[model samples]
Target: NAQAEEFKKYLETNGIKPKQFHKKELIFNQWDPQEYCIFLYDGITKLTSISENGTIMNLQYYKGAFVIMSGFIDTETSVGYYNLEVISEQATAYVIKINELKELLSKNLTHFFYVFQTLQKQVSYSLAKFNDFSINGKLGSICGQLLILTYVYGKETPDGIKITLDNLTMQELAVSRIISKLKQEKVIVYKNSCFYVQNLDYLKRYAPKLDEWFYLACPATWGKLN
Candidate 1:
């Protein structure tokens, strides 16, 4: 009974219109109240959600993904309150009026979580002393540990997330010395703040993942990031 009513209301309120857009560009605005749900009947679209004052909240690139931007069905938040923007070409989208979502995945969400957990596990121990240590070797050790996670736990994806330690600096001598110690041991070499993984496996054995680095970014966060 609950399911049918939710589905019925979703269909009744959502009006269908033929629309087209360019690739990797914004398709929807945040303030539309009627856009409670969006489904990919056909075609491709990248989904993203935005926070208030228009900052990226999360992002996901869904090709065959069952894109659901509804909040009620998720038992999480109101879908209307968040912004869903499409970044794809010739995307055919259906704006549904569903009270809740029927499904969240057009792809196996298990593999997604597996990749997510892997990254989560990698960042756990590396960040234990975050913001507490001022020593560069201590800091470099921390940075070194993070490099380990980035190499092992990090995934190279089309999403453009490169977890390499290339863009970090160790200034404030104490921190620099920590990094220097690592350099002396041949642990990490640096150029332009981006530290490359000189030894990927060694870091994996020591620092795996801390809760600070272990996060499963929801695919529903298809079009949002902060």
Candidate 2:
């Protein structure tokens, strides 16, 4: 709670303004200059990357995290997003214009290093996700996804962590039998499409060396950036 508070203070200190959007709202469309990078304070959102050929991949999701817009950071090399949509009922975010952030960071070298470090943390998380899926097979990937979702959106409980699996389809479930398999394993309880992770620490043991990344990038667990 202190960490989250500190992060919020940091953003406010730098003059980031909060904004709210309703569910299914378009946060931004493709080629929109990527002028702002949002720090999500609440609710889940999906970032869908669409290619020039009309191919689509649901690449990234954000909750309780700083979303580094690829077009903002990468500029030349980023695949870029076709659209960002609010998947949850309501979303709250603190928005900072990239130029203003860069300007503020330019004034303080120490803060600038933290900004770069934040970028590195996100890159590391992405790499870890890629490795989990590429090397560990379907089960591992599923576990990784579950872990990620929990780390980003979950609320800690006395039992463990809880996350809502809202608006998922059968086709999505068919690709990864996350709900049924985790229930059968007793590692998680799936009731009414919400996951109750009974064994938070043990859940990552199913996958190979992903717990470190999960903690490192997780807003609740991350300490370095704070």
> Judged by TM-score, which candidate is best?
2
In order, the Cα lDDT scores of the candidates are 0.43, 0.63
Q: Write the per-residue lDDT of candidate 1 for residues 15-55, one digit (tens) a residue.
A: 44535554544445555544455544444454456665666
What local lDDT score does residue 109 receive in model 1, on the 0 to 100 scale? 57
How much lDDT does candidate 2 score?
Answer: 0.63
**Clash count, one per candidate:** 38, 0
My TM-score estimates for the predictions, one after another, are: 0.32, 0.71
Which regions of candidate 1 deviate over 4 angstroms?
1-19, 24-28, 41-46, 49-53, 74-77, 99-226
Per-residue lDDT for 155 in model 2? 78
TM-score of 2: 0.71
